CSV table of N, CA and C in Angstrom, one decimal:
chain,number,residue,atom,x,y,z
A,1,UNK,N,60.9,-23.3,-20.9
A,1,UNK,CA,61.8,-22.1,-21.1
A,1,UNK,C,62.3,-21.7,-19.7
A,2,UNK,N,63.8,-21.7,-19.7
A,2,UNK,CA,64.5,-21.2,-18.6
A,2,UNK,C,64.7,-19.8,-18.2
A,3,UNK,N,65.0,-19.3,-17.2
A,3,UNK,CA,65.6,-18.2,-16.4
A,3,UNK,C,67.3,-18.4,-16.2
A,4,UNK,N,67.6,-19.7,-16.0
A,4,UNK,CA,69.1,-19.9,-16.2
A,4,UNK,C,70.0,-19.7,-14.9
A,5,UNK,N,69.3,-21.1,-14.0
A,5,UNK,CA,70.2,-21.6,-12.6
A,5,UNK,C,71.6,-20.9,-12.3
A,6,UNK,N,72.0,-21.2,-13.5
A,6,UNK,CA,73.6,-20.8,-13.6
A,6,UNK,C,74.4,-19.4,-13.4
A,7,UNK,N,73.1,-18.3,-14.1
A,7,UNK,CA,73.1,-16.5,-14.0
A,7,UNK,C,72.5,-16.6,-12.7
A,8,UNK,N,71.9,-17.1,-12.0
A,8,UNK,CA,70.9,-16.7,-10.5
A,8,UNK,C,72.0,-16.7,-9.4
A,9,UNK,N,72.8,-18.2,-9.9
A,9,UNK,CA,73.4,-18.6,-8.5
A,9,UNK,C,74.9,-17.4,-8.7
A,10,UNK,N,75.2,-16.6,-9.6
A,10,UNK,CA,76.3,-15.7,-9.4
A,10,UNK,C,75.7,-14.2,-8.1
A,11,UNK,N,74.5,-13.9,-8.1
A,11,UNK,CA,74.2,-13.3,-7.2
A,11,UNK,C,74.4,-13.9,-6.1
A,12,UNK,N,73.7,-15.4,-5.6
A,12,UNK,CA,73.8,-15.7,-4.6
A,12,UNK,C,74.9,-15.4,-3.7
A,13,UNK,N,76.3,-15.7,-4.4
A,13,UNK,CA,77.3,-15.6,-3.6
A,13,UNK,C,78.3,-14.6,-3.4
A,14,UNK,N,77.2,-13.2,-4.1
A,14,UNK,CA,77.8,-11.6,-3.4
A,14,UNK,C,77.3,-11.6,-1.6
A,15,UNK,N,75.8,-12.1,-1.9
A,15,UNK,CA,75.0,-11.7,-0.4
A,15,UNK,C,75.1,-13.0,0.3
A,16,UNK,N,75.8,-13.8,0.1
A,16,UNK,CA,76.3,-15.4,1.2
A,16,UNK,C,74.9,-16.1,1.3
A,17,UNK,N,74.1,-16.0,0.1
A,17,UNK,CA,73.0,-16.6,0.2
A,17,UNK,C,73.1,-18.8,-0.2
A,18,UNK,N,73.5,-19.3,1.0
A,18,UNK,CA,73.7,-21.0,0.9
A,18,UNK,C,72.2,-21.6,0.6
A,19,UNK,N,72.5,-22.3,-0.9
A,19,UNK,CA,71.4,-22.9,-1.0
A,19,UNK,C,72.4,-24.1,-2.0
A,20,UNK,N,71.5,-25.3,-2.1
A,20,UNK,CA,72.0,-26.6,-3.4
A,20,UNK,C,71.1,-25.8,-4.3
A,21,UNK,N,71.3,-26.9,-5.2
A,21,UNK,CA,70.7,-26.5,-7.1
A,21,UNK,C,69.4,-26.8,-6.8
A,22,UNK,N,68.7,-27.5,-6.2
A,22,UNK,CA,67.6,-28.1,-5.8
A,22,UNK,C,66.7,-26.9,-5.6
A,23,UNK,N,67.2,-25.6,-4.2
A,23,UNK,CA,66.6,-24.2,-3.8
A,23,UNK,C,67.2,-23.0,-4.7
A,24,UNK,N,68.5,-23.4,-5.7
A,24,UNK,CA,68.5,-22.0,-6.8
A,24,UNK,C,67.4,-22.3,-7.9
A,25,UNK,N,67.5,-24.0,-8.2
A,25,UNK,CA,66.4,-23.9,-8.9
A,25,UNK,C,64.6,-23.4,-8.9
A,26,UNK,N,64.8,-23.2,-7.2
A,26,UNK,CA,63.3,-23.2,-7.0
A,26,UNK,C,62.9,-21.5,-7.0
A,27,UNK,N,64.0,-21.0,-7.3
A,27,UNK,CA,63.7,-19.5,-7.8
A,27,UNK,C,64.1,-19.1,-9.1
A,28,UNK,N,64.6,-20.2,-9.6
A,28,UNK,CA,64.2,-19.9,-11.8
A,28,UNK,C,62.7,-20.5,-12.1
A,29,UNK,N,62.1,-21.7,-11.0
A,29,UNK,CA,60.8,-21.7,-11.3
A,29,UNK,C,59.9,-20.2,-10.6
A,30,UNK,N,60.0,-19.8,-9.7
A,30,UNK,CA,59.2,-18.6,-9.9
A,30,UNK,C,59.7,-17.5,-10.6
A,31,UNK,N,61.0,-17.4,-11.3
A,31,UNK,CA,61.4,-16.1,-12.8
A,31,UNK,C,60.4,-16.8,-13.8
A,32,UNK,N,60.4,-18.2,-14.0
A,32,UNK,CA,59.0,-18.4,-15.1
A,32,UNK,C,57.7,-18.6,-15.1
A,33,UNK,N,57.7,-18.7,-13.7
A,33,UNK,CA,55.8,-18.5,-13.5
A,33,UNK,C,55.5,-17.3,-13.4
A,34,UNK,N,56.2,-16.0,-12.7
A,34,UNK,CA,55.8,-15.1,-12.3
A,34,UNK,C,56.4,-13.9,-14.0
A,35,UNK,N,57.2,-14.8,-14.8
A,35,UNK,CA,57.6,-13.3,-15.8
A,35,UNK,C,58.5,-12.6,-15.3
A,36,UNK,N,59.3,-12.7,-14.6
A,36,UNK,CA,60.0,-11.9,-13.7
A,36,UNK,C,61.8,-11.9,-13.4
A,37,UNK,N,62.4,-10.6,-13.3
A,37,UNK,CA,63.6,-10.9,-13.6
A,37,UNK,C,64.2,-11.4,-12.1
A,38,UNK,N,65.2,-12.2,-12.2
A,38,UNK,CA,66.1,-12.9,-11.0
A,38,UNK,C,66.5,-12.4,-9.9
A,39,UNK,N,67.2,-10.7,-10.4
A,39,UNK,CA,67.2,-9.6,-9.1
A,39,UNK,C,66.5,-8.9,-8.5
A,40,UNK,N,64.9,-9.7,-8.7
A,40,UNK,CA,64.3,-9.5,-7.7
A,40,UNK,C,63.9,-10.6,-6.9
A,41,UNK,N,63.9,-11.8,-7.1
A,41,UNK,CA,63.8,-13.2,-6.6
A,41,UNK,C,64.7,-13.3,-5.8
A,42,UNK,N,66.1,-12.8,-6.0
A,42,UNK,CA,67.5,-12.6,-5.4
A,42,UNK,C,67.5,-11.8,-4.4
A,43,UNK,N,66.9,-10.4,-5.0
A,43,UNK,CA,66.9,-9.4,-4.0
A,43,UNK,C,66.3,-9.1,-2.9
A,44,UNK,N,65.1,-9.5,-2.8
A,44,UNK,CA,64.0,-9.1,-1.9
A,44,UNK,C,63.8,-10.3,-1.2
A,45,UNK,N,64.4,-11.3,-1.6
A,45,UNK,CA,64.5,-13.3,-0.2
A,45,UNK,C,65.4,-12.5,0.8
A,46,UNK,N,66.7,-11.4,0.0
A,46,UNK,CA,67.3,-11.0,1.5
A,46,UNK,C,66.7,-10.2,2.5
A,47,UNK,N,65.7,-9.5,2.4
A,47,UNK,CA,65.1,-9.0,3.5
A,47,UNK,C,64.3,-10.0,4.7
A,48,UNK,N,63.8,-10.8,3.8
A,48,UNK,CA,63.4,-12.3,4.5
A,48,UNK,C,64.2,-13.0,5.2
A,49,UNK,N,65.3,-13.2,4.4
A,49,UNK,CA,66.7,-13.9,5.8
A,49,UNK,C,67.0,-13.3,6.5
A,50,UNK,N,67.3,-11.6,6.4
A,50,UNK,CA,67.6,-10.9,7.4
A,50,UNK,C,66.8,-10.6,8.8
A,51,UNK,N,65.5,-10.5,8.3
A,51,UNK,CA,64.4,-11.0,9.3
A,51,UNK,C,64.4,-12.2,9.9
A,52,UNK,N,64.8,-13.6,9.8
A,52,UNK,CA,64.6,-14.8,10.3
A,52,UNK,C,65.8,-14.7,11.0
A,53,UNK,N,67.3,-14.1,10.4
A,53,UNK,CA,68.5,-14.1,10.8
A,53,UNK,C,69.0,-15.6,10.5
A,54,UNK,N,68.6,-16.2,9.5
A,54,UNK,CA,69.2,-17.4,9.0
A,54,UNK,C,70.3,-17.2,8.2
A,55,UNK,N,71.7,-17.4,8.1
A,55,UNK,CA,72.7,-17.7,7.2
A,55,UNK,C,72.3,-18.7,6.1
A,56,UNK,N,72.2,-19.8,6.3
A,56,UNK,CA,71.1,-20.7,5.3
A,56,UNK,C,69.9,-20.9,5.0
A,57,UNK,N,69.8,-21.2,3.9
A,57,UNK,CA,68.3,-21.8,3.1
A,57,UNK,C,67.7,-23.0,3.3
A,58,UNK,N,66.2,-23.2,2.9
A,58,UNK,CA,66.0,-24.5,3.4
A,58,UNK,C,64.3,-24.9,2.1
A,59,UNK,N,63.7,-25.6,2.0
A,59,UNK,CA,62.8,-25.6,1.0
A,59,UNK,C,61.7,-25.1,1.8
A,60,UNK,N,61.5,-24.9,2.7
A,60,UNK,CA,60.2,-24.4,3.7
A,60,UNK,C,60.4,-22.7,3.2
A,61,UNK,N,61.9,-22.2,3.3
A,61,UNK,CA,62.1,-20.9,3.3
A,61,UNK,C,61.7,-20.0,1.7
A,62,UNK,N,62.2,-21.0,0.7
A,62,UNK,CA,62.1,-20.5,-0.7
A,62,UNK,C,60.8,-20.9,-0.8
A,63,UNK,N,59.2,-22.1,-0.4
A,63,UNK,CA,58.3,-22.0,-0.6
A,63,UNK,C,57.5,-20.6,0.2
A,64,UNK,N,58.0,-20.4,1.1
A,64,UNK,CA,57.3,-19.1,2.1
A,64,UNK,C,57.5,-18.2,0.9
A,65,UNK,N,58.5,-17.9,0.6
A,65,UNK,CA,58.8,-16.1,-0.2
A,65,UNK,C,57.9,-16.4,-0.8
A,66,UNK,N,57.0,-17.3,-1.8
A,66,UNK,CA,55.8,-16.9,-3.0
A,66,UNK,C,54.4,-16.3,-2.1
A,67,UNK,N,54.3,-16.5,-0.8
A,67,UNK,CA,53.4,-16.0,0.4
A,67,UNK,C,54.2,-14.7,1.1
A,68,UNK,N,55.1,-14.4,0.8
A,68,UNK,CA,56.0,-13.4,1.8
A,68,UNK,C,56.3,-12.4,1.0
A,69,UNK,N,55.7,-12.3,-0.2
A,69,UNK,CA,55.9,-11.4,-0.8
A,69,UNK,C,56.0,-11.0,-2.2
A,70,UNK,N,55.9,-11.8,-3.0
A,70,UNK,CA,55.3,-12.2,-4.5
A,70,UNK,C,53.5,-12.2,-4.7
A,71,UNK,N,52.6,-13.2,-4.2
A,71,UNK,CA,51.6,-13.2,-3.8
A,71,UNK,C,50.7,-12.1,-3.8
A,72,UNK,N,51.2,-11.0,-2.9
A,72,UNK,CA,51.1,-9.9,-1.9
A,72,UNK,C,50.9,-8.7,-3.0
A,73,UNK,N,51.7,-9.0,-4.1
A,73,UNK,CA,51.8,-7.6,-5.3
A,73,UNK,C,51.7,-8.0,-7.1
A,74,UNK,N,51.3,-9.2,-7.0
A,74,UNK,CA,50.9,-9.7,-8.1
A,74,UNK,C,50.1,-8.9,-9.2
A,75,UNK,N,50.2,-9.2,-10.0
A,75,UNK,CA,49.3,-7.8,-10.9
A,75,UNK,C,48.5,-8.7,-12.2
A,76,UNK,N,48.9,-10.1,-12.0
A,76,UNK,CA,48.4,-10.8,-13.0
A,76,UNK,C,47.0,-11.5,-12.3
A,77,UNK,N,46.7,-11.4,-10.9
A,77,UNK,CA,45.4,-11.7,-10.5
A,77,UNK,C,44.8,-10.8,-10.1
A,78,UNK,N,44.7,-9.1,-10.6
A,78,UNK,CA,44.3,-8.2,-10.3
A,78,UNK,C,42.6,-8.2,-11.7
């Protein structure tokens, strides 16, 4: 069951977020592990690039965010 690559990546390119299908897809796999809607997988990676100051994405960056901040407030390992 999908989250839907295709609705994720229209956010991307309000906030100039560069990624391939390879790293949009790697945040529809955390909308279906975590249950969770896309604007915030969307939303909250930008505080993270704003912090690094990176214009682009990279697979190091989209595996960090499940430690950078998903992880951190989980309510299903509570």
């Amino acid at each position: 069951m999908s989250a839907s690559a295709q609705q994720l990546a229209e956010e991307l390119q309000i906030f100039g977020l560069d990624c391939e299908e390879a790293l949009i897809e790697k945040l529809v796999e955390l909308c279906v592990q975590y249950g969770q809607n896309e604007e915030g997988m969307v939303g909250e990676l930008i505080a993270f690039c704003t912090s690094t100051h990176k214009v682009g994405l990279t697979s190091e960056i989209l595996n960090s965010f499940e430690h950078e901040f998903l992880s951190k407030r989980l309510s299903k390992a509570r």
